[PDB]
Write a protein that binds this ligand. Structure first.
Ligand code: A1EDY
Ligand code: CL
Length: 147
């Protein structure tokens, strides 16, 4: 009865069941809440040395490895989930995208405009829901669906 995209999983450290979405890479303890022409999303991008364009407003030459970029993404997700930091604040400070200046907001879009892994995650998110690490040719993203 699980919605499409979701599967049951088992915590290795605790043995508690949880749920994982293989389109958004989201994970949560609770059983998921069982298509819009357009969605609106914000994102936080962390680029790496294999990014299509290894440059951003933060850094002329982006040299961190993909594994280092994933570790940074994972740390931002932990702080957002703990409430220690707000998504909008981390995006303004640390996103390797020009949309950092707008708290990560990309505005609204339909299918056919974004890179495919980003588009698929954006449209599989519920309104208000955050993705896990999403990989594109630009880098690694945290995606927040706002509308
Ligand atoms: N700067 C930047 C990089 C990647 C994306 C997502 C996509 O292209 O699908 C959006 C903005
Ligand atoms: Cl929704």
């Amino acid at each position: 009865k699980l919605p499409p995209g979701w599967e049951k999983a088992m915590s290795r450290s605790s043995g508690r069941v949880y749920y994982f979405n293989h389109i958004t890479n989201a994970s949560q303890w609770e059983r998921p809440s069982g298509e819009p022409a357009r969605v609106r999303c914000s994102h936080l991008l962390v680029k790496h040395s294999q990014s299509r364009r290894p440059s951003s407003w933060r850094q002329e030459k982006i040299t961190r490895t993909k594994e280092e970029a994933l570790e940074l993404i994972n740390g931002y997700i932990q702080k957002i989930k703990s409430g220690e930091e707000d998504f909008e604040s981390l995006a303004s400070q640390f996103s390797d995208c020009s949309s950092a200046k707008a708290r990560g907001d990309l505005g609204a879009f339909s299918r056919g405009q974004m890179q495919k892994p980003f588009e698929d995650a954006s449209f599989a998110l519920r309104t208000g829901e955050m993705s896990g690490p999403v990989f594109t040719d630009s880098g690694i993203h945290i995606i927040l669906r706002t509308e």
